[PDB]
Each structure stands twice: as structure tokens, then as C-alpha cells.
Amino acid sequence: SNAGEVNSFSGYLKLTDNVYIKNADIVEEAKKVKPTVVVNAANVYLKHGGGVAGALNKATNNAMQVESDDYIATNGPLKVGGSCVLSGHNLAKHCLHVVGPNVNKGEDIQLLKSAYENFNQHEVLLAPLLSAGIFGADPIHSLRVCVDTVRTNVYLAVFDKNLYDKLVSSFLE
């Protein structure tokens, strides 16, 4: 355990030994903290067209999309449950692009475990809840999978207050 690069997360609520949560927006948090790692809720093509991915890419002035396209040219598509490490641009040192399953499109919810397992390669991460939004997974379930799978330190930014309250209630009541 060392100080390393300062990840100045403020106002988080500790849910478990290693999972923290804040009612906040991930882009705002990244700009204020400039964490070592920000997680993107990616798709297999790294096409950052909406949701968290679109917001992160916009905050980088499209640099993230340009870099992602170059990576996909070398790699081909990611797999569901997989990830890649690219630059964090002006938001973080690194961006961990993680593909959770899109159950709204018929993909396997069990791969949410694989998706969160990628976080264990990083000591500390700023992240959204995976497979939310258009990906269609139950957010309470996604938080549970996160808690049960991630063993490194994860700081979750959940912007919607009602959802945040629902998630925190699943742990305090």
C-alpha cells in the first residue's frame, strides 16, 4: 500500500471494504479528481455514441473516439465481458473500456461478472454501474455483481438521485 498518484475522491459512501458510491456524475468527478483510471461503459466496437461513453468521449473533444478507432483497427471488436486499456486523455491517466452484456439485445447477464473482473487489474478506479441504461440489466443486480467480483478499490458515480437512493438502500436496510 503506497500513496502513488493522488486520487482525491471526496464525499463517497463506503458500501463494503472496497466499494464506494457517490451521487455524482462521472465526467464531473473525473475532471475534479483526474483519477488514475476512469471506466467507460463501452460496446464491442468502441463506438462512443451515447450514455456514459458518449459523455466521456465528448469531454475528451473526440480524442477518445479517434484513439478507439485506431485500437479497433488493430484488434477487431472486443468480446462481451472484455476490456481494453487506452488513454484517459484529459479525464484520467487511463480509460478502462469495459463491455458489459446488453440484455436488451439478448446477451448473457452472467458476463457481467467477467466485465467487473477486469477492474481487478487496477488498484483504484472511478466507474459507472455497468450494463445500465440501454444495456438493460437491473442496477441493483449490477451493484451486487460489482461488490461480489471487484476486490480492488472502486468509486462508483451514480448521477440519478432516485437510483442512487435505491442502490444505497439495498445495502443499509
Q: Which secondary structure element, helix H or strand E, spans residue 40, and what is its range?
A: strand 37-41
Place of cell 485500437: 71
Q: Residues 40, 133: contact at Cβ < 8 Å? A: no
CATH number of 13-172: 3.40.220.10
Residues forming beta bridges with residue 83, ordered by sequence position: 98
The grid coordinates of residue 97 equal: 473500456
* 84/98 Cα distance (integer angstroms): 7
- Torsions phi, psi for 107 (to 5 deg): -75, 160
DSSP character at residue 112: H
Task: Please report the DSSP string for 57-97 in residue order.
Answer: HHHTTTHHHHHHHHHHHHH-PPPTT-EEEEE-TTT-SEEEE
Cα 118 to chain centroid distance, Å, stands at 10
Cell 488514475 -> residue: 36
Record the resolution, in angstroms.
0.9
Q: Identify how the structure was determined.
A: X-ray
> Do 157 and 37 contact (CB within 8 A), yes or no?
no
**N-to-C CA span, the chain:** 32
**C-alpha radius of gyration, the chain, whole number:** 15
With beta carbons less than 8 A apart as the criterion, state whether 119 and 154 touch: yes
Do the beta carbons of residue 66 and residue 7 sit within 8 Å? Answer: no
Residue environment code for 142-160, b if the CB has 16+ CB neighbours within 10 A, otherwise e: bbebbbebbeebbbbbbbe
Selection from 19, 38, 16 nearest residue 27 by Cα: 38
Strand order in the sheet with 83-87: 13-14, 19-22, 153-157, 124-127, 37-41, 94-98, 83-87
